[PDB]
């Protein structure tokens, strides 16, 4: 089974979710999942020499307004491998509806005091937004980053996404 | 299920195939699949300080004249992880013979760096030489010897892929 | 199926076992398997700047005193990826109790790296290397308030007996 | 001695120049040389998660129209270490003007990597790779508020002429 | 000339100092400088599988109580290469014993750290990890080190100025 | 000053020598020193996908064959950076010819990595590792049409004898 379907959204939803990582921090290769099997698949090589600034993936058993799993960005000191599960605490949301959750690992004590969007250095939020603003520029795509929402908003959206998945897939 | 059996050979065969990568470029560890489970498995550590010059794996649902999956070499700038699927355009074929053990050479469809690589003449000669030399010498300390009987072009590679897709059906179908 | 349950303990047990690697040498991230799915999972980031000194994982279809799969440490020159199977020759065993639980761990070498062809017993390992591995286990959870006791190292015969015992514990637990 | 002053511009200028590399391909840290000593120095950490797409450095004993050493970008498969000299064949030139000054940069390949033996002019480079390099320079300082315009790429002949100009400009300035 | 002797202590001491890095974050090899030449030298391979948690080096033209240059620890996201100079803002000081204290600093030119100005800006677990590294990394060599705690940015800056003065006394 | 000329051969020659490392284990880029400045320089990219199996460099103030520095190979677990000095204990010597000239190379271990404390002679090295090093030298220039011949390995006593000869020749010939 594709792990997107097999894994639960999290152990204490929405305060703690599972993040199924597709793309380790530092990658220029953009990975996704094969729909039928759930094997890792190369979506594309980014057209610019940019790298993912976060460990990037999806929350299992979620679906969202834009017709795809709900994306999640986990701040990790040492990247994980693709297809690794991280227990993640949502701390905010990037408003790109194609919004993406920002989260920290529960089990890295470095981040113990990161509980809301105000705990993240502004330069780091700017770097993440800039990456999503420009990484597909050479593919003729544009995106506006509207801004960042707080942890409460992120959690509300996670609950919506958990419900949408149950509705679409049963 | 073992992904070698579960995945299709490609989305537009033989122009575009799936390469199931087993070994990232730069690895001295030689990985294969466990037959029953499809888990990555260490076949061996190469006996010499050589590394794979390409991302290396197999085309799903293929079987080749030599009684193994058909091997494919994908030229990647940044290596992928083992068990990653790459949509790949065949551009040629290495005529390795230990005895028909030929291997497809391909480029990723979705790396625009390679957009104009469509045939064997598009590859730098020194790079074809480096790949051939690797396969010529990497098992020398294991007492194996192999001959590289040249490179074939994209048309030849594509024909061989279709033959291997049919071989698999004959064997497992 | 979780590969811990699906994969046999090894091709020629206990002389050659399968090591199902969870943590590559050089990682500070400590990985484990999700019970239901067998996906790789982050257990924790180590609280100190230590890295795993060996490729670390479990022997499939084993269980041990501490209520977990039997752990195995494979000495690899180039680390493997998580969820890679290595055919491993046991050469010794680290006798360690964690919070009062027997939590011994097999030490092994890859059968198919000729560098290790003459490593067959615990006496073939450099003393400083055994010391470094023991020290890692002695101190890696110190900042989590744990204290671990390292008893010493057993030989290849002792390791192999424990592997067979653990294969049997698994059958009792899950059979 | 600062190697930027001590080394010659090249062994056969402008056909073959020395590239003194400051920044390996793959770095997000932007390095420069300390003026007095010639040690490597961190200029900045790029404000965006971008990495240098080329091995990046300077041609010794050059000075360019923007009042700096003339920059050179060497296409390398495996990155070198900072302060490594590469014998480099110029193949083209990136026409950049940033913050309002003419800050063009040579594009070159290593003479001694046979992979690049048939790269001799700008037409030999994949278009997407030229695009990626230009986009990096167009956007890597966006979060610092810096204006940039990439006018396009010149050919090997143009690059070589500019190198000779820069060699002479250094003489004209430093003696 | 050995860069320890050749470089100045910093461009705006003690607010901004130069850190001459010897050991990148992530190294298990412990490097130092050859005294005569200033070439990087392997001091030892750490006896345990620990890696440096910070980019580690010295402040040029300093000397300290224990008869050595004043050590500095710089928090980088991406490690630098040995013999790289970093312009560094001191934010605190690890107290370790003769006094063998070590400055904790952040790079001026990484905006990630713009709001790191004092020891209270550092995650507690990160301070704990650095202290634990120094407490235990020589344990297999028979050494013990008590970590006495962490001082603040003001304390760190005073010690930097004291060390610049001690160098002048030692070397002229 | 070029460190090859400035540094001494070692602190207790020939029992402990200095190895000035040019090429870290794992490199496919072959580095050398610029004669005039002593800066690291790319000699070539190896024509085959092979990497140096050891940390490779030279013993300072030695004169071998045609007046070249004596080469030394240091076995390191974690590679060092180019231009790093390692205190090294010679344990053997690789006897080989390159383009028809004797071009023997010392094999050594780091004094200050306790992993290697009991490595003191050529018999202490796994046979497969000696074979891997020899094979690298046998084949790494094959695509350059270069002819190398590998003769075998000498022991620590022989290695030390050859180091001292090269130290003495430098005393006679340099300058
Ligand atoms: N094979």
Listed in order, strand segments (DSSP E) in E6-126 are 17-23, 29-33, 40-45, 55-58, 71-74, 84-96, 102-107
Number of domains in chain A: 1
Are F52 and B49 an interchain contact pair (Cβ–Cβ within 8 Å)?
yes
Listed in order, strand segments (DSSP E) in chain B are 17-23, 29-33, 40-45, 55-58, 71-74, 85-97, 103-108, 147-153
Q: Which domain holds residue A81?
A: 2-170
Pairing, β C71-74 against β C17-23:
unpaired
Counts for chain D of helices (H) and strands (E), in that order? 3, 9
d(CA C66, CA C77): 30
DSSP-derived secondary structure letter, B49: S
Q: How many CB atoms lie within 10 A of CB A21?
A: 28
Ramachandran angles phi, psi of B42, nearest 5°? -75, 115
Which DSSP string do the residues of D122-145 spell out, in sequence order? GGGS-HHHHHHHHHHHHHTTGGGT
Pairing, β C105-110 against β C71-74:
parallel
| Secondary element (H or E) of residue A19 | strand A17-23
Ramachandran angles phi, psi of A153, nearest 5°? -65, -40
3-state secondary structure C32-50: EECCCCCCEEEEEECCCCE
Nearest to B70 by CA among B150, B166, B136: B166
Pairing, β C17-23 against β A84-95:
unpaired
Is B128 buried (19+), middle (13-18) or exposed (0-12) by CB count in 10 A? Answer: middle
Q: Which among A47, A52, A131 is the nearest to D48, CB-wise? A: A131
User: Could you tell me the sign of the dihedral formed by the alpha carbons of F154, F158, F159, F163, in that order?
Assistant: negative
| Secondary element (H or E) of residue F127 | helix F127-139
Please, are residues B82 and B40 in contact by the beta-carbon 8 Å criterion?
Answer: yes
In the Cβ-directed half-sphere of D36, how many Cα atoms lie within 13 Å? 6
Is B155 buried (19+), middle (13-18) or exposed (0-12) by CB count in 10 A? Answer: middle
Angle among Cα B85, B89, B93 to the nearest 5 degrees reads 105
Ramachandran angles phi, psi of C152, nearest 5°? 145, -170
Ramachandran angles phi, psi of A107, nearest 5°? -100, 25
Are B37 and C81 an interchain contact pair (Cβ–Cβ within 8 Å)?
no
Which DSSP string do the residues of chain C spell out, in sequence order? --HHHHS-S-SBTTTBEEEEEEE-TT-SEEEEE-TTT--EEEEEE-SSSB--SSEEEE-TT---TTSSPPEEEE--SSPPPTT-EEEEEEEEEEEEEETTEE--EEEEEETT-GGGTT--SGGGS-HHHHHHHHHHHHHTTGGGT--EEEEEEEEHHHHHHHHHHHHHHHHHHH-
Is C8 buried (19+), middle (13-18) or exposed (0-12) by CB count in 10 A? Answer: middle
Which of E29, E48, E52 best probes binding to F when mutated, by most F CB atoms within 10 angstroms?
E29
DSSP-derived secondary structure letter, F123: G
User: Could you tell me the sign of the dihedral formed by the alpha carbons of E113, E119, E125, E131, in that order?
Assistant: positive
Q: How far is CA A119 from CA A103, A124, B173, in A?
A: 11, 11, 58
d(CA F1, CA F37): 7
Q: Do chains B and F touch (3 or more CB pairs under 8 A)?
A: yes
Please, are residues A72 and A94 in contact by the beta-carbon 8 Å criterion?
Answer: no
| Secondary element (H or E) of residue D164 | helix D156-174
For chain D, say whether B133 makes contact (Cβ under 8 Å).
Answer: no
Structure tokens at E121: 């800006």
3-state secondary structure B83-113: CCEEEEEEEEEEEEECCCCCEEEEEECCCHH
Nearest to C22 by CA among A72, A83, A25: A83
Only one residue has tokens 């400051």, namely D22
d(CA E40, CA F84): 5
**3-state secondary structure at position F144:** helix
d(CA F20, CA F73): 10
Which of C5, C18, C112, C116 best probes binding to B when mutated, by most B CB atoms within 10 angstroms?
C112
| Secondary element (H or E) of residue E135 | helix E124-136
In the Cβ-directed half-sphere of E62, how many Cα atoms lie within 13 Å? 30
Ramachandran angles phi, psi of C134, nearest 5°? -60, -40
Which DSSP string do the residues of D4-15 spell out, in sequence order? HHHS-S-SBTTT
CA–centroid distance, residue B44 to ligand 1 (Å): 11
Question: How far, rounded to the nearest angstrom, does the alpha carbon of residue F174 sit from its chain's CA centroid?
Answer: 20
Nearest to A78 by CA among E104, C73, B77, E77: E77
Q: Report helix angle F127-139 to B125-137, nearest 10.
A: 150
Q: Which residues contact E57 (CB under 8 A, 6 or more apart)?
A: E19, E20, E21, E22, E23, E71, E72, E74
For chain A, say whether D115 makes contact (Cβ under 8 Å).
Answer: no
Q: How many CB atoms lie within 10 A of CB B1?
A: 9
Which residues of E fall within a CB distance of 8 Å from D82?
81, 84
| Secondary element (H or E) of residue A6 | helix A3-6
**3-state secondary structure at position F129:** helix
**3-state secondary structure at position E162:** helix
CA dihedral A91, A132, B112, D45 (to 10 degrees): -90
For chain E, say whether C171 makes contact (Cβ under 8 Å).
Answer: no
Are C117 and F126 an interchain contact pair (Cβ–Cβ within 8 Å)?
yes
Residues B24-39: b if buried by 16+ CB within 10 A, e if exposed: bbbbbbbbbbbeebbb
Structure tokens at D159: 């690059």
Ramachandran angles phi, psi of C108, nearest 5°? -145, 165
Is C35 buried (19+), middle (13-18) or exposed (0-12) by CB count in 10 A? Answer: exposed
Ramachandran angles phi, psi of B40, nearest 5°? -60, 145
CA–centroid distance, residue B32 to ligand 1 (Å): 9
Alpha-carbon Rg for chain B, nearest whole angstrom, is 15
Only one residue has tokens 């969820």, namely C83
Nearest to A119 by CA among A87, A159, A75: A75
Structure tokens at C42: 């982050």
**3-state secondary structure at position B128:** helix
**3-state secondary structure at position B156:** helix
CA–centroid distance, residue B163 to ligand 1 (Å): 19
DSSP-derived secondary structure letter, A70: P
Angle among Cα F57, F169, F141 to the nearest 5 degrees reads 40
For chain E, say whether D135 makes contact (Cβ under 8 Å).
Answer: no
Are D127 and B115 an interchain contact pair (Cβ–Cβ within 8 Å)?
yes
User: Could you tell me the sign of the dihedral formed by the alpha carbons of B15, B16, B17, B19, in that order?
Assistant: positive
d(CA C126, CA F116): 7
Q: How far is CA E155 from CA A122, E106, E132, in A?
A: 28, 16, 21
Residues forming beta bridges with residue C154, ordered by sequence position: C93
Which residues of B fall within a CB distance of 8 Å from D126?
112-116
In the Cβ-directed half-sphere of E40, how many Cα atoms lie within 13 Å? 22
Q: How many CB atoms lie within 10 A of CB B99?
A: 10
Please, are residues D86 and D18 in contact by the beta-carbon 8 Å criterion?
Answer: yes
Which of D77, D110, D115 best probes binding to B when mutated, by most B CB atoms within 10 angstroms?
D115
Alpha-carbon Rg for chain E, nearest whole angstrom, is 15
Nearest to D80 by CA among D18, D134, D140, D26: D26
Question: How far, rounded to the nearest angstrom, does the alpha carbon of residue D62 sit from its chain's CA centroid?
Answer: 12
3-state secondary structure D28-57: CEEEEECCCCCCEEEEEECCCCECCCCEEE
Structure tokens at D29: 């840290």
Nearest to C5 by CA among C161, C164, C173, C159: C173
Are D78 and F27 an interchain contact pair (Cβ–Cβ within 8 Å)?
yes
Ramachandran angles phi, psi of A41, nearest 5°? -140, 140
d(CA B117, CA F155): 51
d(CA B27, CA B44): 11
For residue B98, the domain's CATH number is 3.90.80.10
DSSP-derived secondary structure letter, E158: H
d(CA E86, CA B17): 49
Q: Solved how?
A: X-ray
Residues F127-141: b if buried by 16+ CB within 10 A, e if exposed: ebbbbbbbbbbbbbb
**3-state secondary structure at position F135:** helix
d(CA C58, CA C2): 12
Please, are residues D10 and D71 in contact by the beta-carbon 8 Å criterion?
Answer: no
Alpha-carbon Rg for chain A, nearest whole angstrom, is 15
Structure tokens at D65: 């129209």
d(CA B9, CA B15): 11
User: Could you tell me the sign of the dihedral formed by the alpha carbons of A43, A44, A48, A51, in that order?
Assistant: positive
Please, are residues C11 and C18 in contact by the beta-carbon 8 Å criterion?
Answer: yes
d(CA F134, CA B137): 13
d(CA E120, CA A117): 19
DSSP-derived secondary structure letter, B67: S
Please, are residues C14 and B48 in contact by the beta-carbon 8 Å criterion?
Answer: no
Please, are residues E101 and E95 in contact by the beta-carbon 8 Å criterion?
Answer: yes
d(CA B2, CA B168): 15
Is F164 buried (19+), middle (13-18) or exposed (0-12) by CB count in 10 A? Answer: middle
């Amino acid at each position: 089974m594709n792990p997107f379907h097999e894994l639960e959204p999290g152990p204490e939803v929405p305060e703690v979710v599972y993040a199924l990582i597709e793309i380790p921090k530092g990658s220029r290769n953009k990975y996704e999942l094969d729909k039928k099997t759930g094997l890792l698949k190369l979506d594309r090589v980014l057209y610019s020499p940019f790298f993912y600034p976060v460990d990037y993936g999806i929350i299992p058993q979620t679906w969202y307004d834009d017709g795809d799993p709900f994306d999640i960005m986990v701040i990790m000191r040492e990247p994980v491998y693709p297809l690794t599960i991280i227990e993640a605490r949502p701390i905010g949301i990037m408003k790109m509806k194609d919004w993406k959750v920002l989260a920290v690992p529960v089990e890295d004590p470095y981040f113990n005091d990161w509980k809301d969007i105000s705990d993240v250095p502004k330069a780091f939020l700017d770097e993440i937004a800039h990456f999503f603003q420009r990484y597909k520029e050479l593919q003729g795509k544009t995106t506006k980053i509207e801004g960042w929402g707080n942890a409460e908003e992120a959690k509300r959206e996670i609950l919506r996404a958990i419900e949408m998945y149950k509705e679409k897939f049963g």
